Every structure is written in structure tokens, then in C-alpha cells.
RNA sequence: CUAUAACGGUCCUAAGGUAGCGAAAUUCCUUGUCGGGUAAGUUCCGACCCGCACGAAAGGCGUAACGAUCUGGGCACUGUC
RNA sequence: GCUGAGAAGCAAAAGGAGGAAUCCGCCCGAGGAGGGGCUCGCGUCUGAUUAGCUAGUUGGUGAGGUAAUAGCUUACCAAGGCGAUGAUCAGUAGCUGGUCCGAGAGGAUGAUCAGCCACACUGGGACUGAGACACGGCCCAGACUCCUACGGGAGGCAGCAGUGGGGAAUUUUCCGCAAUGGGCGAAAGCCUGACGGAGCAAUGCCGCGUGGAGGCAGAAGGCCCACGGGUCGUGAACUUCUUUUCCCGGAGAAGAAGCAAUGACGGUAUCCGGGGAAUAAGCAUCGGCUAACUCUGUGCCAGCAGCCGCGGUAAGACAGAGGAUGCAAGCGUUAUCCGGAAUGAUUGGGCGUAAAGCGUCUGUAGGUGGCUUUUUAAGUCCGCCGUCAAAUCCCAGGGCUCAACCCUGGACAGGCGGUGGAAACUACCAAGCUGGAGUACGGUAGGGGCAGAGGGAAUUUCCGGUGGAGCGGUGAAAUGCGUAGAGAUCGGAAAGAACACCAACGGCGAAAGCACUCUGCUGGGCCGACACUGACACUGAGAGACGAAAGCUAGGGGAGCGAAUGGGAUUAGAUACCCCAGUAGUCCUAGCCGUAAACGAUGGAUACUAGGCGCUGUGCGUAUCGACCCGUGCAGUGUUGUAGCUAACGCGUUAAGUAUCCC
RNA sequence: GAUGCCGAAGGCAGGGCUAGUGACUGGAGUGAAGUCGUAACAAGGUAGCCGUACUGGAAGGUGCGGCUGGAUCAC
């Protein structure tokens, strides 16, 4: 407002706060699954969601969502996790990239296959 | 009365918005000059001086109402630029021009007060007092 | 969900232990249980409360300084060993 | 030449080539250019929940030391130096040409490419030398690896490659000195993991291709279908033309610099011939933003999702199919940054009720500051010069077939420095001026404040006289008080607290607040006069003072009221509302606390913008010659309302209007 | 060769700052469904709100002062 006041540095910006701190400024991180289990979603959305707790290379433990239909993942599995938020579940900020490391690609998905890590059928 | 210029400008704006032709302003070299210029531009009908108790008052006739007082397509705008808190100066090539030139800009320069047109002919920059629509 | 009981019913009294503290100079069972200190701790320090039988001028709970006080540990030091 | 006032004193060499001429050297001066060392102005991140830091520290002398100035060193003298404009301390970071984004103003960042700094296993030293405190040198200590015949030694990839490890992730233990650049040499020449090239990788930007023209409107098939037909679809099949790319053969550079010679790339780039549509299309999306829709399968399941949100029997939102759309050798997802964001606002926001005006003043730094004349020229403005490296961005051409890329030439900005001018505005210097702010004078209203006197109702209790059953209280009751004489009533005392009517949509106060009456000490306010000073102003970070009620410390005081507490009820319960009692406190003195819906939910100053109806204080004219009365000038105070403002309500000369300044 | 001054690791000691962890305990947040009540929004069934003190299982209750962002009636 008052110039005199602006010259006391009364304008300071609000820094950008990341949505996936556990990644520490990376596209992906590799992790090991501590636990694999299911959780119920915030109402009125009821279903049963597939989530696994992953301990990462950056040391954190987070809870990440597993997309697609069905999975082979079990404890002491080395997966790769990526960003992005599931609006449903509280606290879950991370997915699991399908088709790499220990997470196989979704079986018999014919469309938008690149998202789920599936070969092209001949 | 921390700023006299802005005060003149303001009294004009107020008398204008109220649809009155006549204004009393307090005179001063700056005031007088500014008003002279205002006349040779054609923004104001007529000016004259009065004196009482060693006070000088320029009274200004103002351009008549537009085809009634109610249906006005046009008002007459004034804006202070360089003010005591921030002084705005410009070189020759930064000299402002208002609405493609339809209005004018008042400059205080080495050769005295003038319009931006005069500054462009003579090649001088300076302190920008106000804008006039 | 196992548990516990903020909540209600009843009995009896003059009234039914509030704040604070609590295995204590008070705790019987009892070396209570847990944590710490030790290679190992029936003592010691912190906490739990199930206070046999704390408790408000027979003061309650804190507290700097002080003590040939009681009690635990450590460095220095040594024929205490 | 060096030391020194001088007298004087002191200091150098190297030869090798050639048959000779002559060449490359050597020593001492004196210059030049380039490369380095210092010193200073300016610019150079976040933190006040980091406020005092510094004693060789800040200066002086004398002696030393350095290539040179210097607390660089040391002794003595003095007490400075830095700091609320942020020192010191902590945290982060190599900086700049530039890169990315932005309409611009400016935000974020510092890979490749170019300049500078700093480092070389972790710390410390010096030596040599024009140059180092020295990456592939020395010495020591330390940590770690290797060799040892165990007595001792060796070593430093953050050089090129390469291995382990960490990780989402980043390449060959390649060729060559031919080009350019370095080092040494009289030259021949030698060495150059600088560099020139190759290889690996869609990592990115750019170009080209995966066919061109024709193709009954007939057939097979997918899918939709009201079974009529629609649609994949000129699409394919099919017929011709073409060969960039692919394949098989040929020839084959410039790059090399003036004596020939000498090419790692490479028999590569390019050029000529021969086959032959032949060797080559995927990936997202299709609810809204957002371009593109239907059907089967599932049924709050399985699943989707960037936000809103879809999905419980016909899902344009899930999964499948067909169809379409978007981009295309890429297409998507995640991460990072700017944008959009006017969402930290200079350009460009707000603060009556949405987040937001300190409770209210006094005032220090700080910022802005009335008019007139002169001065100066710090800003400001104009001209000229120096520079702000090249590369990048911008413009104009040129070269690789084009483009990307490369090359030449040139420049706007904008910054800093020197100099010549201009003098309006800010700033300075000299004199002036009242309308701003004050002083004196004379008035006048006032619950302004502090202090000291006095006054009456009413109530309670106590002392009597009368009198003799209920009083008191509730929605209805009961506790309670009463034959020990209550209440009622009359007379007496005593005490404390509060001040009826006046009182009013009235007065004063900075706010809080202030009212029975009086007197004293004192603060302001306003009005009328020129009597005077002559800008003395406005605001205010820190700082100060005041600051309702409750509360607390110490001493008084205690009628009523009354938190707490107790009893009576009411109620499922009633730790509440109601009633009966009643302790703190309410009061006074001396302090502390410093908060309130301390509200106009509206910071202060100034200037300027219709009115109507009111009030208070004063002044003028009129009315009478004193009270009105009228018209008016100010100062404040209240109610409707025009312009304008506002999201609306509303505010509206006492702004929330139009402008300036400070917090 | 010896020795003086200065001297890096190394040693001891008290400091400032921060990292991790700790029996137990205080509150915060999200949990359709649990318990106790019904404080708030209508005059929310005793008007509401702010400061403050005392007390209550708990929302709260009362006292003292303040305001209307109070309804009803007064106009
Ligand atoms: Mg602004
Ligand atoms: Mg953003
Ligand atoms: Mg400039
Ligand atoms: Mg049960
Ligand atoms: Mg009970
Ligand atoms: Mg009970
Ligand atoms: Mg009962
Ligand atoms: Mg009984
Ligand atoms: Mg009793
Ligand atoms: Mg009882
Ligand atoms: Mg207890
Ligand atoms: Mg209690
Ligand atoms: Mg305790
Ligand atoms: Mg024990
Ligand atoms: Mg005891
Ligand atoms: Mg006991
Ligand atoms: Mg015992
Ligand atoms: Mg232990
Ligand atoms: Mg133990
Ligand atoms: Mg013992
Ligand atoms: Mg104990
Ligand atoms: Mg007892
Ligand atoms: Mg006892
Ligand atoms: Mg007792
Ligand atoms: Mg005792
Ligand atoms: Mg003690
Ligand atoms: Mg004694
Ligand atoms: Mg000792
Ligand atoms: Mg002995
Ligand atoms: Mg000699
Ligand atoms: Mg010699
Ligand atoms: Mg020879
Ligand atoms: Mg010879
Ligand atoms: Mg020389
Ligand atoms: Mg920077
Ligand atoms: Mg000294
Ligand atoms: Mg923008
Ligand atoms: Mg690098
Ligand atoms: Mg470089
Ligand atoms: Mg160095
Ligand atoms: Mg290393
Ligand atoms: Mg070293
Ligand atoms: Mg030397
Ligand atoms: Mg070297
Ligand atoms: Mg070294
Ligand atoms: Mg090396
Ligand atoms: Mg060593
Ligand atoms: Mg060594
Ligand atoms: Mg060596
Ligand atoms: Mg390497
Ligand atoms: Mg590896
Ligand atoms: Mg790895
Ligand atoms: Mg890669
Ligand atoms: Mg060479
Ligand atoms: Mg060469
Ligand atoms: Mg040479
Ligand atoms: Mg080689
Ligand atoms: Mg190279
Ligand atoms: Mg390849
Ligand atoms: Mg390529
Ligand atoms: Mg390729
Ligand atoms: Mg890829
Ligand atoms: Mg392309
Ligand atoms: Mg075709
Ligand atoms: Mg051909
Ligand atoms: Mg070609
Ligand atoms: Mg040649
Ligand atoms: Mg060919
Ligand atoms: Mg559409
Ligand atoms: Mg989808
Ligand atoms: Mg996204
Ligand atoms: Mg349905
Ligand atoms: Mg069905
Ligand atoms: Mg269906
Ligand atoms: Mg159907
Ligand atoms: Mg679908
Ligand atoms: Mg499909
Ligand atoms: Mg991409
Ligand atoms: Mg912005
Ligand atoms: Mg914001
Ligand atoms: Mg806003
Ligand atoms: Mg509100
Ligand atoms: Mg508000
Ligand atoms: Mg206020
Ligand atoms: Mg406020
Ligand atoms: Mg305050
Ligand atoms: Mg002030
Ligand atoms: Mg001042
Ligand atoms: Mg000034
Ligand atoms: Mg002026
Ligand atoms: Mg350049
Ligand atoms: Mg061009
Ligand atoms: Mg061309
Ligand atoms: Mg160029
Ligand atoms: Mg320039
Ligand atoms: Mg200049
Ligand atoms: Mg002048
Ligand atoms: Mg003067
Ligand atoms: Mg008094
Ligand atoms: Mg009386
Ligand atoms: Mg009688
Ligand atoms: Mg009785
Ligand atoms: Mg009696
Ligand atoms: Mg009698
Ligand atoms: Mg009586
Ligand atoms: Mg009395
Ligand atoms: Mg007032
Ligand atoms: Mg009063
Ligand atoms: Mg007075
Ligand atoms: Mg004078
Ligand atoms: Mg202040
Ligand atoms: Mg005070
Ligand atoms: Mg009080
Ligand atoms: Mg108390
Ligand atoms: Mg007292
Ligand atoms: Mg009493
Ligand atoms: Mg009472
Ligand atoms: Mg009771
Ligand atoms: Mg009692
Ligand atoms: Mg009861
Ligand atoms: Mg009473
Ligand atoms: Mg007091
Ligand atoms: Mg407050
Ligand atoms: Mg008030
Ligand atoms: Mg009258
Ligand atoms: Mg007024
Ligand atoms: Mg009003
Ligand atoms: Mg109004
Ligand atoms: Mg407003
Ligand atoms: Mg040390
Ligand atoms: Mg230590
Ligand atoms: Mg608890
Ligand atoms: Mg809770
Ligand atoms: Mg639940
Ligand atoms: Mg209620
Ligand atoms: Mg109520
Ligand atoms: Mg209400
Ligand atoms: Mg109570
Ligand atoms: Mg009560
Ligand atoms: Mg009240």
C-alpha cells in the first residue's frame, strides 16, 4: 500500500509446496512393499481399494494405490512408484507403475495399454 | 494542501462531475500556466483572475453539458501521474501519448511547461505532471 | 470385539475425601508392573494407582539457600581389598 | 644501476654452431605490449522465536616485514570501529555473460557453450622458480588400499575411457596427430585421451519417407439397424505411373596450409546404372472444461478420476467391440519451473458487515510539506566520448539441396563513468509573504479532572410504646421468619452505599468515562478582533502515559445486592432457570494487572463536491433600543436525501464520494 | 646437531546449536452406525454475543461490566 512500507519488504511470495514430498524431486522412486492390504473409501463411494505400504529409497514410508484389475504383488516385492493423487482415499498420494520391476502388466487389457504396462497383441 | 497541482486537478474534476461550469481555484505560476495550456488545447471555455485580501482566484468556465445533463456520453477526466511520493520522469522516447493522441500529457521541462506535442517538436523529456482525457 | 465406566438405580448416614500428592519415614500381599542407572540392582531415580490404612493449620503441595542429617550414583584417590 | 644529505660504498658475464660471412645465445640498464598482485564506489540470497558484537579489535608513533600500500608483524600510546537502513550468530548457495517463461513491468534458474573464482584422499607446511603455497612434485600427520623374502616399501581417476557402489536415471577399457592450439628444438622432428573424428542412445530440435493417379458403385466381412437400410469405404482387392528411402554393382571429393609430399575421418559425403509398390504406423482421447458416440458385458461389485464427481438393470464417465477425433515416428504418464493468478497488487488489490483500523492519545528517528523572488546544479533533461568480451536474443544478407545449424555486418534498449549545455519541477542558498500552525488580548458554555466541605429520601439492624396470628413467597407450593410477640404502625438512635424528578433522538471528554449541592486547584474547546511570530506543519517504526468490569497484594469498611456454598422445590435427572438464606467481591486508601461487541464493528491530516428539516455554543445585521424575532458567519452535533460510490445492504459535506501524504 | 617462537592432527574440560530415540502423559484430526446430554440457529423454549472470576461429567450455569450483530411492543 504505502510505498514507504513496501520498501520495508512487505511483499514476499508464497513458495510452491510439492504434492509428493516423499519423492524428493523425482519422476519415480523404487520401493519395497512392507504390507499389502485393502481399505474402504470415503463415503459415498463404497468399494474395496487395493493399496500397499511402501518403504522407499528416500527412507520414507508411504501408502500407494495399485491401479488396474488384479495384481500379483506381495510383501518384500520391489516396485516402482510414481506421483498423482487418489481423491478417494485419505492420505494416499502415490500410484504404482504397472509393468516394471515386480508389478506385472494388467492381464488382458486391450485399450490405453501404455498406462497399465501391457504388450501389444499380435 | 500537501500537493497544489493535484488539488487544482481535483477541484476541476469535482466541479465537472457535478455539472457546473464555474470553478474557483487558487492561482500560482504552475496553476496559471497549466490553465493557459488547458485553454489553448480547448478543454475549458474561458479563464480569468480575481483578487481579495492578497489571495488570487482563477475562475474557470467549463464546456457546456452534453445535449442535456442526464444523457451524457462524455465526461472530462484528469489524472495525477508524478506525485510527491513517486516522481515519474521520461526521456524523449518514453514520452507518453494519451489514447493515440486524442487527449494530452502535461510536461514540466527545462524550457517550461508544455504538452507532449511541444516536447516532440523540441526533443525534450521531463517530469510528467498529469494526463488529460 | 474383549475390556473398562463418563451415565443411572438402590442403601445408609451429621456428611460421605474436593485441590494436590501417591508402593511414600505411610504399601500388607510385595523384590507390585513398566522405564532408567549396573556385565549382574530386594536399595536408588521417573512413572502407573489395584491409597490393606495419603490429604488440606495434629496443615496439603512446591521450593532457592542451608545440614558433623538420611539415602543412590560418578571422577580423583588410596593396603579397604 | 642500487644504498646514502653527502662522503663514499657495492655489483656482471657463457659459450655453441659454420671453412669464413654470419646465426642461436649470455650480462647490465631503459622502454612496449600482454599476463599477474593489490585498493576503493556501486550492485551481489532467507531468518528478530538471531541484539549487542569486536580488544591486534578501530586508529597514532617507533622498530621490523613484504614485489608493493596495509595491524601484514611487534612494542608503546589513545578509545575507538561496526549496529534496529539488521551488526554479530545461524541456514542455504560457486558468481556472471546467459537459459526458460512473461502483453509488459519483471518472476524462476546458472547443464552443454564462453569468462572469473575455488579445490585436487582429509588437514598443515614450505622448497624450486618470472610465475605455485603447485591435480599426474616434495615433507609431515591422519584415514584407507596394495606389494613384502615382514626387516620395510608403494599409492591418490573431481584427466580419457573402464569396474564396483548409490540411484528413477546418463555411452566405447575405439582411431588418429591429417586439421586447429600448445611444449621443447638451429632445423629435421618428437610428445600432446587439449583437440579432430568415429561408435552407442528417439534425449532433444529439424527434414524426409512409409506410395502417386485411376478404381463397376458390383461382391466377401466387421459393426449399427425401427430389418427398409446405414457405416467401415475409393478404403482394400484391382489397373497403370514413379524409386526419395531399401537392395546389387560401379566411379568418388573439398577438407592441405603454395616445394613436392603429407587425410584419422573413409573408399564416407556426393554422382551414374540395374531391379522392384517394392523394405517400413503407432499412441492417446471420445461426461463438462475439450475436438470426437453408439452397442454388448458388469451391477455401490470389478474398476475410473486433473477438479466437479461416475458405477445399486438398458452406464455417451467402468471393461470389450465397432466407429470417430487429435497428434504423428512419436504418443502418453510422473517430476521440476514460469504462466494463467489482479492469488503478495510499482504498472495492478484491499480493510463499515466477506480475511483485515493498533482501545486511546503524547511524541523521537523516518517520510511527505503552502505562496513569491534569487542562487546553485545534486536529481531531472539534451548533445558528444569511453566502455558494458566473443557466442546467444533482435534486424539485414550469405552458405550447407531446405530447415535446424554455421558465417558476415549492424543496432535499439538499459547500466556505469567523463565532459558541454538547459533551469520548469524536487533538492540546495539568500531574502521575502500571510490563508496553514501558534502566542497575546477580550469574551462565553460545560455531569472535563483532582482535592475539601455539606444534603435528603429509601433500606437494614438495634432500643422502646401499641397490637395480637399469621407474615413472606410461587405457575401452584414448600424451606424461611412468628405467641421467646413476627409482619403492621408511631417515636427514637446508628451505619454504609447509591444520587429520584430535572433527563432530551441534550452537555463535556483523547478514549475509557463523567450528573444531589457547594467551594477551592487546574486541563482543554470554540467564537471576535490584525495585536504579534512568519511554515514553526501532518503523521509516526521503536518508546511513553492513560486505560470499563472482573481479578490480585497490604490496610481499612461492610447497609443493600450477590459469584461460590447450603436448604426448598421443578424435573427421568437438574451440579440450571424459580424461592429462602448468604461468603468472596462490590466501597475507601496505596499499588499491580492492561484486557472488552474498549463499536461508528469506520486510523489520522488536508483540499473539493445539491439540498430539506433539526439542536448546542457563540458573532453580526434586523426587531425593539431588552426577551424573543427574523435572516446570516463560523464551530460541533442529529435525521431524510441529489451527484457519485458500493457485491448488495447502504454511505452520502460528521462520506464508505473525488484526490494527496503518513501509520 | 641442538634449542626458542609460531605451529596441524591428537587429548581433556565446560559451553552454544541441532539430529535421533524414550516408560508414561497432554491435547488435535478424520472415522455411517456407540454412550451422556441438548449448548447454538425461531423470543431455539432462561434473548444472544465479548472480557473476566467462581463452579460443574460434558456441552455449559451464575456473578460483574459492556454491545445489539436483540425478538415482542412502543412510531
Ligand atoms: Mg498499489
Ligand atoms: Mg502453479
Ligand atoms: Mg535514466
Ligand atoms: Mg459388549
Ligand atoms: Mg445419581
Ligand atoms: Mg452413580
Ligand atoms: Mg432417584
Ligand atoms: Mg438419615
Ligand atoms: Mg447435617
Ligand atoms: Mg445434606
Ligand atoms: Mg482425586
Ligand atoms: Mg474440578
Ligand atoms: Mg502427578
Ligand atoms: Mg519396589
Ligand atoms: Mg508427607
Ligand atoms: Mg496408607
Ligand atoms: Mg515391603
Ligand atoms: Mg536397563
Ligand atoms: Mg527395574
Ligand atoms: Mg547398596
Ligand atoms: Mg519412587
Ligand atoms: Mg484416612
Ligand atoms: Mg498425616
Ligand atoms: Mg486438622
Ligand atoms: Mg510440617
Ligand atoms: Mg529442597
Ligand atoms: Mg546447625
Ligand atoms: Mg581433576
Ligand atoms: Mg598394610
Ligand atoms: Mg665481485
Ligand atoms: Mg654464473
Ligand atoms: Mg656440426
Ligand atoms: Mg667449429
Ligand atoms: Mg628489460
Ligand atoms: Mg542469483
Ligand atoms: Mg599490541
Ligand atoms: Mg502477467
Ligand atoms: Mg557438469
Ligand atoms: Mg568452463
Ligand atoms: Mg590453489
Ligand atoms: Mg575420491
Ligand atoms: Mg595439501
Ligand atoms: Mg623464490
Ligand atoms: Mg602439476
Ligand atoms: Mg599440495
Ligand atoms: Mg590424477
Ligand atoms: Mg603418511
Ligand atoms: Mg605417502
Ligand atoms: Mg611419491
Ligand atoms: Mg572418468
Ligand atoms: Mg553399476
Ligand atoms: Mg542400482
Ligand atoms: Mg537416457
Ligand atoms: Mg598437431
Ligand atoms: Mg601444430
Ligand atoms: Mg619456437
Ligand atoms: Mg590413442
Ligand atoms: Mg572432443
Ligand atoms: Mg540404432
Ligand atoms: Mg535421430
Ligand atoms: Mg536412429
Ligand atoms: Mg523413451
Ligand atoms: Mg518430426
Ligand atoms: Mg490412393
Ligand atoms: Mg528406377
Ligand atoms: Mg537425400
Ligand atoms: Mg599439396
Ligand atoms: Mg539408385
Ligand atoms: Mg464436444
Ligand atoms: Mg477413461
Ligand atoms: Mg497433471
Ligand atoms: Mg438403474
Ligand atoms: Mg442382465
Ligand atoms: Mg448395460
Ligand atoms: Mg437394444
Ligand atoms: Mg469405456
Ligand atoms: Mg477400439
Ligand atoms: Mg513427451
Ligand atoms: Mg504474479
Ligand atoms: Mg495467496
Ligand atoms: Mg481481495
Ligand atoms: Mg462475522
Ligand atoms: Mg471482520
Ligand atoms: Mg478505532
Ligand atoms: Mg478491532
Ligand atoms: Mg496495544
Ligand atoms: Mg502525534
Ligand atoms: Mg520531526
Ligand atoms: Mg524537505
Ligand atoms: Mg512547492
Ligand atoms: Mg555481446
Ligand atoms: Mg535470417
Ligand atoms: Mg539458404
Ligand atoms: Mg553477430
Ligand atoms: Mg548506453
Ligand atoms: Mg552521463
Ligand atoms: Mg529556480
Ligand atoms: Mg526561507
Ligand atoms: Mg472527591
Ligand atoms: Mg433523615
Ligand atoms: Mg397487649
Ligand atoms: Mg419454623
Ligand atoms: Mg430473644
Ligand atoms: Mg405485651
Ligand atoms: Mg417490625
Ligand atoms: Mg450518616
Ligand atoms: Mg464531543
Ligand atoms: Mg454514573
Ligand atoms: Mg475551565
Ligand atoms: Mg517579517
Ligand atoms: Mg506504535
Ligand atoms: Mg497503568
Ligand atoms: Mg474492580
Ligand atoms: Mg481467588
Ligand atoms: Mg482486602
Ligand atoms: Mg453482609
Ligand atoms: Mg438476597
Ligand atoms: Mg441446591
Ligand atoms: Mg455455615
Ligand atoms: Mg434436588
Ligand atoms: Mg439478606
Ligand atoms: Mg486502585
Ligand atoms: Mg483485542
Ligand atoms: Mg464502551
Ligand atoms: Mg423560534
Ligand atoms: Mg460543521
Ligand atoms: Mg446515519
Ligand atoms: Mg443518509
Ligand atoms: Mg468500502
Ligand atoms: Mg585443535
Ligand atoms: Mg564436549
Ligand atoms: Mg485424554
Ligand atoms: Mg477428540
Ligand atoms: Mg464410527
Ligand atoms: Mg437450547
Ligand atoms: Mg437461550
Ligand atoms: Mg438469538
Ligand atoms: Mg452454580
Ligand atoms: Mg444462585
Ligand atoms: Mg449482564
UniProtKB/Swiss-Prot annotation, chain A:
Molecular function terms, GO-annotated: rRNA binding; structural constituent of ribosome
Gene name linked to the record: rps12-A
Keywords from the named record: Chloroplast, Plastid, Ribonucleoprotein, Ribosomal protein, RNA-binding, rRNA-binding
Annotated protein name in UniProt: Small ribosomal subunit protein uS12cz/uS12cy
Entry GO terms, CC: chloroplast; ribosome; small ribosomal subunit
PANTHER family referenced in this protein's UniProt entry, alphabetically: 30S RIBOSOMAL PROTEIN S12 FAMILY MEMBER
Any one of the GO BP annotations: translation
Signal peptide span: none
Further remark: Exons 2 and 3 are cis-spliced, while a trans-splicing reaction is required to link exons 1 and 2.
Family: Belongs to the universal ribosomal protein uS12 family.
Organism: Spinacia oleracea
Biological function: Component of the chloroplast ribosome (chloro-ribosome), a dedicated translation machinery responsible for the synthesis of chloroplast genome-encoded proteins, including proteins of the transcription and translation machinery and components of the photosynthetic apparatus.
UniProt-listed InterPro entries: NA-bd_OB-fold, Ribosomal_uS12, Ribosomal_uS12_bac
HAMAP family: Ribosomal_uS12_B
Compartments where found: Plastid, Chloroplast
Curated annotation (Swiss-Prot), chain B:
Main subcellular location of this protein, as a coarse class: plastid
Record keywords: Chloroplast, Plastid, Ribonucleoprotein, Ribosomal protein, RNA-binding, rRNA-binding
Keyword Nucleotide-binding attached: no
PROSITE patterns per the UniProt record, alphabetical: RIBOSOMAL_S8
MF (Gene Ontology): rRNA binding; structural constituent of ribosome
Locations listed in the record: Plastid, Chloroplast
InterPro entries: Ribosomal_uS8 (IPR000630), Ribosomal_uS8_CS (IPR047863), Ribosomal_uS8_sf (IPR035987)
Disulfide bonds: none
GO cellular component, one term: chloroplast
GO biological process, alphabetically ordered: translation
Its biological purpose: Component of the chloroplast ribosome (chloro-ribosome), a dedicated translation machinery responsible for the synthesis of chloroplast genome-encoded proteins, including proteins of the transcription and translation machinery and components of the photosynthetic apparatus.
Assigned protein family: Belongs to the universal ribosomal protein uS8 family.
Assembly and oligomerization: Component of the chloroplast small ribosomal subunit (SSU). Mature 70S chloroplast ribosomes of higher plants consist of a small (30S) and a large (50S) subunit. The 30S small subunit contains 1 molecule of ribosomal RNA (16S rRNA) and 24 different proteins. The 50S large subunit contains 3 rRNA molecules (23S, 5S and 4.5S rRNA) and 33 different proteins.
HAMAP family: Ribosomal_uS8_B
The name this protein goes by in its record: Small ribosomal subunit protein uS8c
The species this protein was found in: Spinacia oleracea (Spinach)
